[PDB]
């Protein structure tokens, strides 16, 4: 099993520090347990979560080498996927809660009736299956980088750099998994299936948004600019 090269350890170093620097708290000791009225309470806590994703991308030099319109398309595509993964890895099976913004435990029913519908089930079921994966800050960071460097986002111009960047991350993230030897069979194939799950979540946020569009003014401006 090939383990990371020197250059790949450096990439891992960059993406892991970028993730840690933009990941709220570090949470189970801050949790503040919790219908446009539920939708309002959720819309008005989302703009910090979107901004942390923007700060994570800006700490990746490969992302900064892209033109600003490709940068915009890339955040718009992966914002909910990254925010969903960050909430899913903070699933507490004892309270059956996800942690939003590092300090807000939410339930399956609270988050569903807050506006996400069946996407709430998808994120919660993802958090359940991610418990036995035992992902660290590095594996989560690399997952976020793979989702961010999706060359199939509509409108992109540098399709072929973006797909090269992703192939870099994908290889360093597979070698890290080889180096790390999880006690789960066919781990790398199963992780790629989780990338598919998060991409499904990203496109289902989009369908739920069109369903929610309530006066657009009641939606916060960055929430509108992502969708």
């Amino acid at each position: 099993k090939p383990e990371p090269t020197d250059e790949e350890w450096e990439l891992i170093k960059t993406v892991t520090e970028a993730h840690v620097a933009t990941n709220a708290q570090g949470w189970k000791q801050k949790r503040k347990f919790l219908d446009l009225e539920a939708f309002s309470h959720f819309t008005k806590i989302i703009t910090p979560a979107i901004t942390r994703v923007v700060d994570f991308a800006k700490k990746l030099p490969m992302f900064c080498e892209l033109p600003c319109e490709d940068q915009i398309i890339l955040l718009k595509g992966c914002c909910m996927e990254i925010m969903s993964l960050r909430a899913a890895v903070r699933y507490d099976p004892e309270s059956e809660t996800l942690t939003l913004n590092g300090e807000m435990a939410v339930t399956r029913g609270q988050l569903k009736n807050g506006g996400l519908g069946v996407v709430s089930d998808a994120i919660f079921d993802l958090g359940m299956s991610l418990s036995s994966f035992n992902l660290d800050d590095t594996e989560v960071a690399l997952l976020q980088a793979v989702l961010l460097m999706s060359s199939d986002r509509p409108g992109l111009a540098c399709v072929e750099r973006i797909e090269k960047y992703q192939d870099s991350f994908l290889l360093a993230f597979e070698h890290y998994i080889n180096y790390r030897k999880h006690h789960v069979t066919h781990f790398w194939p199963k992780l790629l299936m989780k990338v598919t799950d998060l991409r499904m979540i990203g496109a289902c946020h989009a369908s739920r948004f069109l369903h929610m569009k309530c006066p657009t003014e009641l939606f916060p401006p960055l929430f509108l600019e992502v969708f």
Binding site: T51, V54, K58, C68, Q71, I72, L75, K76, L222, E225
Partner: peptide, 11 residues
């Protein structure tokens, strides 16, 4: 459009 997002990206 995308003015707010573009501000956050252009530092």
């Amino acid at each position: 459009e995308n003015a707010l997002l573009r501000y956050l990206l252009d530092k």
